[PDB]
């Protein structure tokens, strides 16, 4: 619907299509195009619900690396070892927060 | 298995696939795609061991 990029695949976000990652390249560009895809939906919940911007996500261990390995602020393109999140589930399932949101 | 990238080489990580290094280019982009492969497994040992 309104969160598509017009040439997108409608319900999947796959890092190998340049329209989904916005023309992104290698990793820091690619994953940071998730963090925009994950904003664009947390916004669109504010339109449908009329309550508020998307307040949480739940997600597989794989995307939580993609969240943990990328600079989540506004900076250039960065990658590395998964840092700010609890990527494993033993200690706890709750892993970090994104940008305090 | 769960640590694959659907087009990868299934048991070897070779820096010459565009799929494995995540479309990385030159080195700093490329070698940082290892560090993400070594995380993706180090996490997956938390799933199998518990």
């Amino acid at each position: 619907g309104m969160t598509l990029t017009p040439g997108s695949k409608a319900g999947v976000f796959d890092f190998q299509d340049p329209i989904d990652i916005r023309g992104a390249r290698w990793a820091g560009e690619s994953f940071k195009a998730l963090l925009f895809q994950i904003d664009k939906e947390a916004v669109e919940i504010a339109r449908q619900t009329g309550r508020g911007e998307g307040n949480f996500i739940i997600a597989s261990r794989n995307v939580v690396n993609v969240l943990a390995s990328v600079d989540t602020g506004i900076s250039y393109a960065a990658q590395g070892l998964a840092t700010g999140f609890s990527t494993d589930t033993t200690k706890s399932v709750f892993a970090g927060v994104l940008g305090g949101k | 298995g769960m640590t694959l990238t659907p087009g990868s080489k299934a048991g070897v990580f070779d820096f010459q696939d565009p799929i494995d290094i995540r479309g990385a280019r030159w080195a700093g982009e490329s070698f940082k795609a290892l560090l993400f492969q070594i995380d993706k497994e180090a996490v997956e040992i938390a799933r199998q061991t518990g």
């Binding site: 190998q16 299509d17 340049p18 | 565009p18 479309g23 280019r25």
Partner: peptide, 25 residues
């Protein structure tokens, strides 16, 4: 369509093929 990541060394070859009168690129 699809997506194949090719470096500029293939595009250096391709811009050398068609600018030297070759037939495919």
């Amino acid at each position: 369509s699809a997506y194949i990541w090719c470096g500029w060394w293939v595009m250096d070859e391709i811009q050398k093929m068609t600018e030297e009168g070759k037939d495919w690129k």
